Amino acid sequence: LVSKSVFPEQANNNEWARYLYYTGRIKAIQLEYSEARRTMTNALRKAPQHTAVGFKQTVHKLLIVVELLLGEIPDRLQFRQPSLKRSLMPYFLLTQAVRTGNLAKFNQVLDQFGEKFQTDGTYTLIIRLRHNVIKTGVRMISLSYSRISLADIAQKLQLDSPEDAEFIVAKAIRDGVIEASINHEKGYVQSKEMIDIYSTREPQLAFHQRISFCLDIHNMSVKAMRFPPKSYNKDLES
């Protein structure tokens, strides 16, 4: 049903926030979390202060779990600022658990808050974090450094074995949200980096993407602008 929806560009503000939000819930379980988290963050902002309130609550609660699924580490400011921090408190616990890299705290929280999560529709997404607990912790360590031992990853993160940590990193680079190549000779995990991106198209490609995105705003604006004054002319304006 989501795929069939073209969902028009000229739609009310509440419509925009709600569609992105549903599409995000659907994508999150799927292992399309990069896209889900962007629409869900957007959805919260876009939703009003009055009519939106029931659904609105639900977007902020679900989104915190969804962002973790990508490997984002959500801030404290996010919890404090709408002033919902109390209701958000359990999700906050998952945020800590994901970061540390140790499974025992993540499994315990999942079952205990299990009933509460199911309402909001989070529970299906909570169980997916078990891959993510480890992923988020290996992700900070692989990107930051160049060649680091599987042995460093395992001591810090509290993983079972370096060998265990070696399979886990392998699977992630296949998913491509940590992007690396592993050399299990000496036994390090190696970062991808070219130390010049000018030789490659990437600064150009980045700019070019914006140019398409920008052009879409111009075409959308020319058509939209005349429509309300036109409507008023036939109906007669005082």
Binding site: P74, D75, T95, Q96
Partner: peptide, 24 residues
């Protein structure tokens, strides 16, 4: 969330004096 750096303050000052000798 909260920065691990704070907890690090007390621990980092002390480490410095010992470490220099311990390791080259």
């Amino acid at each position: 969330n909260v920065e691990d750096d704070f907890s690090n303050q007390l621990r980092a000052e002390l480490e410095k004096h010992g470490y220099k000798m311990e390791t080259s």
